[PDB]
Amino acid sequence: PVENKNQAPAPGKHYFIIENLCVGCGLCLDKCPPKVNAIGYKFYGDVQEGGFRCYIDQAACISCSACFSGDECPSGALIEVLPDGEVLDFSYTPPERLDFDLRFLHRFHR
Amino acid sequence: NDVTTAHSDYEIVLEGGSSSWGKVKARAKVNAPPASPLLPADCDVKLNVKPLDPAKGFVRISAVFESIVDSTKNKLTIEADIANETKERRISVGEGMVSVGDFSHTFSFEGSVVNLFYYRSDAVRRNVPNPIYMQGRQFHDILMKVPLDNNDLIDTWEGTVKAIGSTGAFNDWIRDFWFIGPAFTALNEGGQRISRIEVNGLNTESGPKGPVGVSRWRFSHGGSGMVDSISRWAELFPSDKLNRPAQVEAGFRSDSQGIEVKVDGEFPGVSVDAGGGLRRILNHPLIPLVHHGMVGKFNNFNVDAQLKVVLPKGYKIRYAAPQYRSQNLEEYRWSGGAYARWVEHVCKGGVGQFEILYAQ
Amino acid sequence: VVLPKGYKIRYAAPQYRSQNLEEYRWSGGAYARWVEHVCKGGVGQFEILYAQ
Amino acid sequence: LFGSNDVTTAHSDYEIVLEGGSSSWGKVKARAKVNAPPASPLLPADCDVKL
Amino acid sequence: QGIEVKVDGEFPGVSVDAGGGLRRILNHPLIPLVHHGMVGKFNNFNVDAQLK
Amino acid sequence: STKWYQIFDTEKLDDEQVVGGHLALLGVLGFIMGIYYISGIQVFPWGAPGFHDNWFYLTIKPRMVSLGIDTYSTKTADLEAAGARLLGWAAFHFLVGSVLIFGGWRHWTHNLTNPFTGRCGNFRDFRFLGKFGDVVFNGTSAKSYKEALGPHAVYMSLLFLGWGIVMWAILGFAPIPDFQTINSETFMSFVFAVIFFALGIYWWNNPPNAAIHLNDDMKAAFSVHLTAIGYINIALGCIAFVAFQQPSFAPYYKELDKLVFYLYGEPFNRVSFNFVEQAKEFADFPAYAILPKSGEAFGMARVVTNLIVFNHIICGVLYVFAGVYHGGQYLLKIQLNGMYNQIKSIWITKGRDQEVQVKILGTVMALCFATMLSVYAVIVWNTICELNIFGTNITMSFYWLKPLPIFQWMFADPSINDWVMAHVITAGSLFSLIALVRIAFFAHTSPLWDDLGLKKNSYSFPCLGPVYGGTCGVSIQDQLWFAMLWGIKGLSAVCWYIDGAWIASMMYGVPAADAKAWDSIAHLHHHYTSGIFYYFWTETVTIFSSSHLSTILMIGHLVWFISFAVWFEDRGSRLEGADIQTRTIRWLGKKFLNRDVNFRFPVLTISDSKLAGTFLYFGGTFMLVFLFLANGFYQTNSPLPPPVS
Amino acid sequence: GPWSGNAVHKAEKYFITSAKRDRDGKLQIELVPASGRRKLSPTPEMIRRLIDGEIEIYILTTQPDIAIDMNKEIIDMENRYVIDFDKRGVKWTMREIPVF
Ligand code: BCL
Ligand code: BCL
Ligand code: BCL
Ligand code: BCL
Ligand code: BCL
Ligand code: BCL
Ligand code: G2O
Ligand code: SF4
Ligand code: SF4
Ligand SMILES: [Ca+2]
């Protein structure tokens, strides 16, 4: 009989890099502001065999997190340590899955 | 004419910094009839929380339930002071008023809730990064006082005195009384088991303007992990995260033609740190999911849903499951597709997860 | 619904689809919605009130 | 026309190879692919059972 | 987005002898069906099912 | 990094946004069609001459002839009627395109308000029409692409029925089932309307489920539809080549050879240095006026047929490549998002196992290598035999190798040329499919990058550095560029075959002896224009004759060897050179400027350098292939005699 | 296979935090996976996984060195540390700040 009013428009930090893992691509350098210059190349030997790696100057590097948030690392050397101590290779790693294939017996994929 | 479709818009505006303090704006309309023998059923509920004292840890919450059912107006207003004494024990001091039609009774209450988890293993918290099913038990001890200022109310108190003093099985049937109708089913569909109550005291002292009936009683809620009150007790009460008066309005109107819902409000605790540096929009409490599925299974529907999560600037979503359809460079939008299937899932009682992980 | 003679439907959960003299017929969309509701366990009302 | 639109699809195959004679043995090979979301609060759940 | 179930098995109790010389595939245990019913009523679906 | 080619990316667009974009594009396309129709007016209805036969209109023309428009008439009155019909239909296209642009703007702004009735139409929920929408659907597709296929097919049925009606009333073509004559396309339009209405209602009542696309439709559905429509366009090109060669289309295409055309840029009558218009070659025509080019010698019928067929074919191949690239982008998105393990559909789960990817790509590589080696050895051996080096006459060549008699039905004159054409098309298809499969399967990790611990984290990352002495061009974008470069060969084979050329050998028709004796020993009633290398020499006669084609030649060549600069591994050299350029431009200081020169010379990113390189490479290559197909057909049905009896 | 989990790592990459040598040896040596959401202990089942090859634990450098001589003292190249003295363990090296 009686009802109340309604409206509803719905309907109608201290980042580190593991030189053992790093391969020296330098996208961290591109992700770093030029004013800081924290990422730097360190040369070890022949360039074609891996050669140079990259390093962070902890004093110069002040909590930008652009490198890791960009998630551009192919090698996973760009790691982030946390105040509690956990280490991150990637911002979000895919979950590990128990992989086993599906083949219907009567369907064409058997 | 035969098609029944649900049109819903959702907006989650998170705020920057460690504290979430998010705003939720939800609109919903569905053509399916409601599962209520009394129709039309209209309700307005206003929940406002205010920080009474940060040093004492006292928060103040006022809930105003205004409802119209079968042309009858009911109003349960309740102002309460919640205080976290310990991580297990919590205290409450409050006053309220229930006015149904011409009848109205005011109540006051002192209440201690002691929530104890059964298992405090470090192994589980060490292994599982996202604990959902946490069993436990909540012991409520409530001393509630009501002025016996009405003759019918006095009759109720007198009859209850004799009922308690006459039947020893009253502690079992009081659950049937308390869980009026389908509620008694829902507790079994949500993993909630309720122990027989214990009436510590049942006495009456008189105030100069009228008598006051005082009843102290205890009961034991028991959660098998699915219960939000037990498993998410810490996420339940973000008093430390609350410094600004938060508030939510929620009104749903249910004619036989359709149901219209509007829920607009800001509150803290929307996003919590799930570990790994990614803030997670909080896991869906499962009790609402199953209890709403109880009525949502009753009819089929087409799904037209749209969620618009407004991230604060500088943050990006790293995980969404299902994926967001469109992005406005700050707002992540889930419209249709597997999100529609998930909306169907949760409407009908599904407890599937919707992992929104976002980070700096 | 065939009423006693001299009575008419006044208030109704979703209204009657057809009305012959003394005969009311609920069909179509909303009544079918309610039927689908009660088949699956819906306890929603169908409040049919008739008066002289 | 029809009602209850926007349904998902589940594709299932079953095979029960029985053994003749007094032997009540059977070989059951079943496959299923359901596009409906699961009811797992911790959704990515893969379990292998070797009995 | 989905569920992928694969069962391979060899069971010694598939067939149950019945009266009159008849043998049958064993009656389905009902606890599986009912316990699956809780999760099976969460979405509307169409099934393409084969059995050999 | 949002670039100027990422602002219109679908990830930022909604469904309504792309609807508005498609409608704006349809309206702009209608405006362009009006331009072309106006450009086809041979004699103005005013009583004056018209436009000089644009290639756009020369392509459009036979289809217009199929309709009541655009009579193949030298009679001035009937040609004026043709111009009148063209202009009227152009104005109608202009009006409809204007309304379509208006609707596209409304859908771009998400501002859907009807001026006559002040109501807002919700994109998520509406009725298609006042009563028809309630008759058919009773509502709207619930914001899911799978649920929209039904209504989309219903709309396509409506469009087919409308096309039949337009043919019935305005163009005056009564539907009869005689498929040889024109007046059955309307009957088949009605048949397709019935069929697609049935399919649309079925798909509305029963939506097909491929749940991969629904979530991020903006890229998954885009990729699937783009690859499907690319194959559809390839099929349309093949069907067009077959049909335009049929006698049924002959009244509408062979008559194009009968009539001459005055093209824009076709050489004019040349006046002398002293022409007193108060000496001139070809004095009958006015000064600086276009000399007529005879269709019979130019082969305008097959020239237009080739333009149409190769336009659709290359557009389809490019659409296939772009569909694969965008599907790779979506797959990379779900691989970084962790949704790749959660797709649950055959189109992903089969490729989820890396060993299956290895097997598929290895089979493709083996087939490509075998077919390519076989056909290339055949080609080079034919070339060796016809040039007689190492003392081998053409009797040792692959002239015996005809297509099988069972398979001979689909060729005009069975020869080694058709064999090599088919083998080259299959080899190039597999050659591009190698890179397409690489995009499909190796969007995140190749088996090498699985063994060597790297992973692709972007769709447009340049490389991974000099580690392992490599890592260049492993991005799906770079694999797309390689696929395009590899399919350039296949598209070139298509163009040269449809234009007419001996693909089975390289120098066929050169003054060498056994190159000329090919036709004598092959028994062909068709004289193919020339061999692969001699094709340029034989077909550039007209390209040099026409100044306009020569201008296109020069511009395309410039574009190509400018692509060279960004294709090579020289970006760092260009960066340091640009720094030197900037330093000397700063040395314009103390050259009396007193102006701070804040202009750093820009050098493109490698992800942008490859983009520009491929765009310019393809652009120059096929700007020149346009001249290949615009030189002429020049195929005479006359076998060559042996040089020595 | 490779797509499940972090695609770089063949085995589950479990970095070792600097929990060390502060209270009766600190047997609760903190093992953290590349995902980083959980924080596990070095229980014998984790050692069973590690000897199974499904997981691989790695020691980092830029931290207080983790019982570097109490876990194992093989220092031929300063990275020959093994838990059960026949492990074939691998150490992650980071001369991050000390190098120029
Ligand atoms: C609901 C499931 C559980 C339950 C779980 C909890 C939880 C959870 C809490 C209490 C608490 C209380 N419980 Mg209890 N309790 C239940 C049944 C009861 C019954 C009864 C006979 O039905 C009684 C008398 C009590 C008694 C009481 C009080 C002693 C105390 C404060 C109540 C108050 O302020 O409410 C005021 C009234 C409301 C605000 C009305 C709306 C209630 C809903 C549940 C609020 C949901 C919030 C929404 C999702 C987000 C809102 C954002 C806003 C900005 C806040 N409980 C059942 C069995 N109980 C609190 C405490 O521990 O006190 C010390 C507490 O944290
Ligand atoms: C007396 C009630 C209890 C209590 C009981 C619960 C329970 C139980 C739950 C929450 C939940 C939440 N509460 Mg609480 N909570 C208490 C104290 C607080 C205080 C505070 C400082 O006072 C705050 C700020 C919050 C804030 C919050 C959020 C962190 C969270 C909801 C997240 C979300 O997005 O919701 C979205 C917002 C909504 C959908 C709006 C709902 C608005 C309506 C008016 C309230 C719900 C009505 C309910 C359906 C019906 C109640 C009828 C009963 C008969 C009373 N709670 C008090 C002490 N709260 C949920 C959560 O996830 O916990 C971890 C949950 O399960
Ligand atoms: C055969 C029909 C094809 C198709 C052909 C085209 C064409 C052709 C165009 C689009 C355009 C777009 N299409 Mg499409 N597209 C298909 C399928 C899809 C699907 C899908 C099924 O999921 C989606 C979501 C889209 C989405 C989109 C957007 C990226 C964009 C329109 C929105 C916008 O406002 O742009 C914002 C910008 C504008 C609308 C105009 C910008 C200026 C100019 C006109 C852009 C021209 C680009 C380029 C030169 C086009 C060349 C074609 C080649 C000559 C072969 N397409 C089907 C299968 N689409 C246009 C686009 O912008 O492409 C990048 C466009 O050019
Ligand atoms: C230029 C023609 C354009 C166009 C231009 C406009 C304009 C201009 C307006 C809309 C309006 C609307 N458009 Mg439109 N729109 C187009 C195609 C679409 C499509 C689609 C089929 O993919 C969609 C989803 C929409 C979406 C919407 C609706 C939400 C809304 C009308 C509400 C309704 O109930 O109207 C019932 C009818 C509709 C759903 C119309 C569907 C489209 C038809 C084919 C074209 C209508 C305009 C045309 C000039 C009139 C003659 C049509 C012929 C008789 C077929 N448009 C066509 C291709 N559209 C109107 C509005 O907001 O209304 C309140 C409005 O003002
Ligand atoms: C649509 C965007 C532009 C436009 C751009 C073009 C383009 C581009 C062309 C024409 C051409 C034509 N245009 Mg127009 N034109 C528009 C508006 C119109 C309208 C109108 C009232 O809207 C009409 C009646 C016409 C009229 C016509 C004819 C004179 C002519 C031949 C049509 C025909 O064969 O269709 C055939 C009709 C059908 C096949 C059925 C309807 C479409 C179906 C449902 C979609 C599937 C078929 C699709 C077109 C081809 C894909 C085949 C695959 C195998 C799936 N234009 C708008 C403004 N117009 C053509 C031209 O001049 O030829 C030389 C031409 O190619
Ligand atoms: C056949 C109809 C469509 C088609 C429909 C789809 C659909 C639908 C999907 C894709 C998707 C993808 N498409 Mg496709 N796609 C086609 C043509 C292609 C071609 C090509 C040049 O032939 C390529 C390289 C691609 C590339 C790709 C990838 C980016 C991606 C699949 C990755 C994967 O793991 O695959 C694993 C490989 C397979 C499953 C191969 C086997 C294919 C089928 C399922 C099995 C039977 C066919 C049999 C092998 C061949 C003989 C019989 C045929 C009838 C001829 N498409 C045609 C045009 N494509 C998916 C994606 O995510 O899009 C963004 C997606 O959703
Ligand atoms: C027409 C074609 C080309 C140019 C035009 C040109 C321009 C140019 N280039 Mg080039 N290039 C190739 C072709 C062309 N490169 C090829 C095919 C390769 C493959 C190997 C290649 C590779 C490298 C490497 C590796 C490096 C460079 C540079 C470098 C310059 C710096 C200054 C200089 O040399 O000026 C000398 C050059 C000029 C006088 C060029 C300007 C007018 C011009 C006369 C002709 C005008 C043509 C017109 C601009 C085209 C369109 C006009 C209109 C539509 C807008 C510089 C002006 C680099 C440096 O910056 O220092 C040298 C460097 O490191 N390259
Ligand atoms: S965190 Fe900031 S300062 Fe440190 S390397 Fe990254 S961008 Fe440079
Ligand atoms: S992105 Fe990774 S591989 Fe590249 S330089 Fe940085 S740490 Fe090294
Ligand atoms: Ca040519």
**Contact status, residue F341 vs residue A93, Cβ threshold 8 Å:** no
CA distance A25 to F471: 10
CA F417, F420, F423, F424 dihedral sign is negative
**SS3 at position F190:** helix
Helix H, strand E, coil C: the string for B256-286 is: CCEEEEEEEEEECCCEEECCCCCEEECCCCH
Cα(F17)–Cα(F15) distance, integer angstroms: 5
Torsion of CA F276, F280, F286, F288, to 10 degrees: -100
A31 is in an annotated binding site: no
Query: From the CA of B236, how far away is ligand 2's center (Å)?
Result: 7
Judging contacts by C-beta atoms under 8 Å, the chain F residues touching residue B306 are 124, 143
Contact F197, F190 (CB under 8 A): no
F218 lines ligand 3 (CB under 6 A): yes
- Spatial strand order of the sheet with B279-281 comes to B271-273, B279-281, B357-359, B316-319
Q: Min CA distance, C43 vs chain B (Å)?
A: 5
Residue F548 marked as a ligand binder: yes
Q: What tokens appear for F313 in the block?
A: 């074919």
Report chain F residues whose CB lies below 8 A from the CB of G3. 335, 340-341, 352, 444-445
Whether the Cβ atoms of residue B244 and residue B254 lie closer than 8 Å to each other: no
For the CA of F453, the nearest ligand: 9
* Cross-chain residue pair F445–G7, CB shorter than 8 Å: yes
**Could you check whether the bond before residue B40 is cis, i.e. omega within 30 degrees of 0?**
yes
CA F542 to chain centre: 24
- Per-position b or e across F547-583, b if 16+ CB within 10 A of its CB: eebbebbeebeebbeebeebbeeebeebeeeeeeeee
Ion ligand 10: residues, Cβ under 5 Å: F 499, 539, 628, 631
Tell me: is residue B7 an annotated ligand-binding position: no
Closest by Cα among F533, F530, F535, F532 to F519? F530
Contacts of A104 (CB under 8 A, 6+ apart): A110, D11, D13, D31, D33, E50
Query: Please, which residues have CB within 8 angstroms of residue F474's CB and are 6 or more apart in sequence?
Result: F442, F446, F449, F456, F463, F464
> A48: annotated binding-site residue?
no
Q: Whose CA is nearest to atom 28 of ligand 4?
A: F121
Rg over CA atoms, chain E: 15
Name the DSSP class of B225: E
| Residue F220: Cβ-neighbour burial (10 angstroms; 0-12, 13-18, 19+) | buried
Q: Please give the method by which this entry was determined.
A: cryo-EM
Residue G24's identity, in one-letter code, is D
Q: How far apart are CA F436 and CA F171, in angstroms?
A: 44
Helices F606-631 and F547-567: crossing angle in degrees, nearest 10, is 160
Instruction: Tell me if there are at least 3 CB pairs under 8 Å linking chains E and G.
Output: no
The verdict on a CB contact (< 8 Å) between E14 and D28 is yes
Q: Is A26 on the interface with F (CB under 8 A)?
A: yes
Q: Tokens 């310990």 appear where? A: B86
A73 is in an annotated binding site: yes
Q: How far is CA G87 from the centre of its chain?
A: 12
- Whether D50 contacts chain E with CB within 8 A: no
CB contact under 8 A, E42 and B338: no
Task: List the beta bridge partners of residue B135.
Answer: B224
DSSP state of C37: H
> Do F619 and F557 form a contact (C-beta atoms < 8 A)?
no
Closest ligand 4 atom to the C-alpha of F114?
66
**SS3 for F512?**
coil
Nearest Cβ partner for A102 among E4, E50, E52: E4
Residues 6+ apart with CB under 8 A from F44: F50, F83
d(CA F520, CA B182): 96
Q: How many angstroms separate the CA atoms of G19 and G26, rounded?
A: 7
Element containing residue F623 per DSSP (H, E) = helix F606-631
Contacts for B4 with CB less than 8 Å, ≥ 6 apart: B30, B31, B32, B299, B300, B301, B302, C33, D3
The amino acid at residue C30 is A
* Helices and strands (H and E) in chain D: how many: 0, 2
Residues lining ligand 2, Cβ inside 6 A: B 24, 45, 47, 49, 59, 61, 82, 228-229, 232, 235-239, 242, 246, 248, 250, 263, 267-270, 282, 285
Q: Is any atom of ligand 8 closer than 6 Å to the C-beta of A73?
A: no
Q: How far is D41 from chain E (nearest CA, A)?
A: 12
- Residue F123: name the closest of A78, G59, G95, A10 by CA: A10
From D9, which residue of chain F is nearest by alpha-carbon distance? F209
Contact A22, G95 (CB under 8 A): no
Beta bridge partners of F36: none
Distance of CA B305 to the CA centre of its chain: 23
Q: Which atom of ligand 9 has the smallest separation from the CA of A23?
A: 3
**Span between the terminal Cα atoms of chain D, in Å:** 48
Q: How far is the CA of F538 from the centre of ligand 10 (A)?
A: 8
Dihedral pair phi/psi, residue F562, rounded to 5°:
-85, -35
The angstrom resolution of this structure is 3.5
- As a residue count, chain E comes to 52
Residues of B with CB under 8 A from a CB of D: 2-4, 128, 130, 132-133, 283-284, 286, 300-303, 321, 338, 340-342, 344-345, 350-353, 355
**Chain B CA closest to residue E2:** B338
